[PDB]
Design a protein around this ligand. Sequence first.
Ligand SMILES: Nc1ncnc2c1ncn2[C@@H]1O[C@H](COP(=O)(O)OP(=O)(O)OP(=O)(O)O)[C@@H](O)[C@H]1O
Ligand SMILES: Nc1ncnc2c1ncn2[C@@H]1O[C@H](COP(=O)(O)OP(=O)(O)OP(=O)(O)O)[C@@H](O)[C@H]1O
Ligand SMILES: [Mg+2]
Ligand SMILES: [Mg+2]
Lengths: 257, 51, 101, 188, 392
Amino acid sequence: KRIQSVPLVIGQFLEPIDQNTGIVSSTTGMSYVVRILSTLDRELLKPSMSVALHRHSNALVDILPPDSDSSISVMGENEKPDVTYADVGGLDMQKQEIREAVELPLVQADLYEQIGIDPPRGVLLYGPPGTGKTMLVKAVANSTKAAFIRVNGSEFVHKYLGEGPRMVRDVFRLARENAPSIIFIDEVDSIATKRFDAQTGSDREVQRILIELLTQMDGFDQSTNVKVIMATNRADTLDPALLRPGRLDRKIEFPSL
Amino acid sequence: LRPGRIDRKIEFPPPSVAARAEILRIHSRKMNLTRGINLRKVAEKMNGCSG
Amino acid sequence: NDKVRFIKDELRLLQEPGSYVGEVIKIVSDKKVLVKVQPEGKYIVDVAKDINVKDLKASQRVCLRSDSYMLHKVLENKADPLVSLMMVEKVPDSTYDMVGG
Amino acid sequence: DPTVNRVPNYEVSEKAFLLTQSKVSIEQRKEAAEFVLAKIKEEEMAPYYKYLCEEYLVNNLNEWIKFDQELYNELCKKNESKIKELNEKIQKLEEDDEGELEQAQAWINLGEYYAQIGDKDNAEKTLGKSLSKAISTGAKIDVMLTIARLGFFYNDQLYVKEKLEAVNSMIEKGGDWERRNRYKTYYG
Amino acid sequence: LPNIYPSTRCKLKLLRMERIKDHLLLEEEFVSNSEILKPFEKKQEEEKKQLEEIRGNPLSIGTLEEIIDDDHAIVTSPTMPDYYVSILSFVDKELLEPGCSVLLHHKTMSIVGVLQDDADPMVSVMKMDKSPTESYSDIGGLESQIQEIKESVELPLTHPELYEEMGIKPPKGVILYGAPGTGKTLLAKAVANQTSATFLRIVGSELIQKYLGDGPRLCRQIFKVAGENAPSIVFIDEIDAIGTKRYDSNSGGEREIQRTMLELLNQLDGFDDRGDVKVIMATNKIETLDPALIRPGRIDRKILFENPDLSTKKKILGIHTSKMNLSEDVNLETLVTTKDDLSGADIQAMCTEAGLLALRERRMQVTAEDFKQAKERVMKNKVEENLEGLYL
Ligand SMILES: Nc1ncnc2c1ncn2[C@@H]1O[C@H](COP(=O)(O)OP(=O)(O)OP(=O)(O)O)[C@@H](O)[C@H]1O
Ligand SMILES: Nc1ncnc2c1ncn2[C@@H]1O[C@H](COP(=O)(O)OP(=O)(O)OP(=O)(O)O)[C@@H](O)[C@H]1O
Ligand SMILES: [Mg+2]
Ligand SMILES: [Mg+2]
């Protein structure tokens, strides 16, 4: 246990190829095939983990508490929004739909399984701008007992190539650890636009971000009881790949009253 | 529509009352159902809706 | 004793530099294989004396030693972009039983 | 409307067991005898007539259900003619090389008529061969529930136990709550 | 190795491959003696060893940008800072076309080879790699059009002697304009069947791209690929698609289509003086075509296609029903040879429909009733006409 000095590079485990080798993606940007230390609890090498790597060798040497690499943090109490269900006047049908598709599935999955319906794993609050799309979710976070990891859309994209899919996987891992949890990717129309330019670096990175989001959302099994919410002002400018069963199915339709 | 090109033009008319009953029965074998639900009555009430 | 010897020798082996994941875009000749290593560019790698060039097929993920890029392993997952298109599209499965009327 | 069909008829075995008990009243026993003879005449329980006359009743009374050879031959000939017709249908579907759904359905028809007269072994063979297709899981559930119902019909509880444990083993490959409630009732 | 005659067994055949082995062993002996005489320390196969050790490993891949002061170049790898790589002697200085894929050395990064593209990621679809099927026998009638297309596209390639002796450059291009469904595409399949040239098909829709830039880019790529794989029989089809339709996916609208058509009308004629690139376009609406395209000197012989006549109809019926499991009850004479108007597409469509109907009944033989039912089926599924009312 000497390689575990304290310069180290955080990596993300991707695929266990053998008993003593793995495919990690160092934060420097490029993937490696490295030898895993024979002391780690190999039962913890879940995909998209937050393992550490030796500086110049990249040999996997330590697994981290998977709630550590997160640049995005679970909303605590200092940022607890100060609106209430009572404050949100109207939107009775919208309130009922979001409650039955977000809160109730979090609380009672056994009823959903026994009845026979498929529990929703995604909502797409949409409508004309200025209709309470953000505020209804804001009121939900003021009453939920579950983690409310709040990402902000365009926050995903950065100059550093590979700081995208990496942080998407990290956010979803953080959501899966603190289950039950609600992700609130906001203004998703900036990430999931339809038209695409396969020649510039701008679109070829947002593409990887969207692909990682889609793959992680498809990876949702029947368990892990984590729901995804995103809001948009323009529903048409949205990739149709985000409107399929297993992905966002329930669609709330905030109308100009 | 020129002959020689795409061949068979197959019609999917909006389902009739029997077709609606069959579809409701097929999609109703996925949830806990109370005994003796007259699905034929519900489909007969369901007019215009399709698939 | 075998376990102890392996554990003692492991310390040296960890300090040996790792290996990049490769992608066999095209086979060049009987001893040179064009490989696109993510995420920068491609290279003309040398196959080891174990791997057979005829065994390699396009889109087979591979490993290259970091010191001097040299083929030393063959992966299993492959890429096959077709099952990526049908996975993104996510068309639900069905049988003749489901369709009625 | 869909139905798994009343094959085999449970009331046949119900009144057969009602008849085979001296503890029950004589009037109810005679009513059961009348019902069972009527059903044997109508629904062609010729193999079950032979079984009921040679085992069960006379195994342990028994005058009302008397083993008549002539009635055992006429209805058996009719049953064999129906089996021959079903074999003709299966062979004609094979010759026409129709869809595998249709050949599977023909196998179910042969097996359900085999159950409709009481022969357990040939019905089991027909439905075991029927399972060999790649039909939907619901059809497999219905078929093996039919063998489970056959096991209930002949009052062999271990047969039902193996059939229902087979149901439970593959019930996780389905999920249809109606086909699971059917299995729940059978298991209960 | 050469070809071998004759096909069957023969002593002269054995003599032929005996000469083959004799000459092959004699080459082998000459090469062996020459090598042995040479100073192995700089000869034999030590050259391979020297080339491998100088080349180094692994050979990176970059892009050439210039050939200034030969023995020097400026490569541009996707990640490297665009070194001033020197050109070694092993590489051939004739394939170093600006924009190729050179093989830089790993450390010193000196060009030690040119990696030919050999990819053709899109052309492979275009490049005709297996003759479709139909020969010129399958086309019933149309003898004049076949003769014209032959003497325009086939004879210049297979038999240039007549043209060089006569002293005329062959007619450049041919446009097959006519009524829809009359064999304009079949004749292209036929000329593709017997061919000694590459046959790069393209349809006019694919030239209506979405981005502004990739309108002339595609046409330039297509004609460059045609030029390098000379000779070429490029078969731009549905050429009227550029004019009409006005697709929403097209960002430019009409103007981008105009630029694309200008690039096409240049590449067909060009200042570049391309070589053996025969062009065969075919369209239903010759009217909506900018006369720059159809001008003589760009496509000379404009072959006209017309709906078949009664004799041509019966010939088409005979050729299409040749591969029929026909019962004798069917009479070809009165089958579709009725003079109540048909087309080259109707005759095959009714045959296909009748075959499908016979398959439905599982009747391996074809009945006259089924043929009549398919006949009327094709008749109802027919937009009759519009201009006949003027002359009706
Ligand atoms: N039901 C409501 N009752 C009271 N105020 C409301 C209601 N819905 C929206 N508002 C007003 O909306 C404002 C907050 O914006 P809001 O959350 O509605 O935006 P939005 O529709 O989600 O916008 P965007 O699509 O741009 O994110 C507040 O000033 C609040 O008073
Ligand atoms: N003279 C003919 N001999 C044999 N087959 C013919 C003849 N005329 C037409 N056909 C048949 O007609 C079918 C359909 O017509 P075809 O596709 O050749 O017409 P086209 O006018 O070139 O097409 P399009 O109008 O769709 O661009 C062909 O598959 C061919 O077999
Ligand atoms: Mg808002
Ligand atoms: Mg055509």
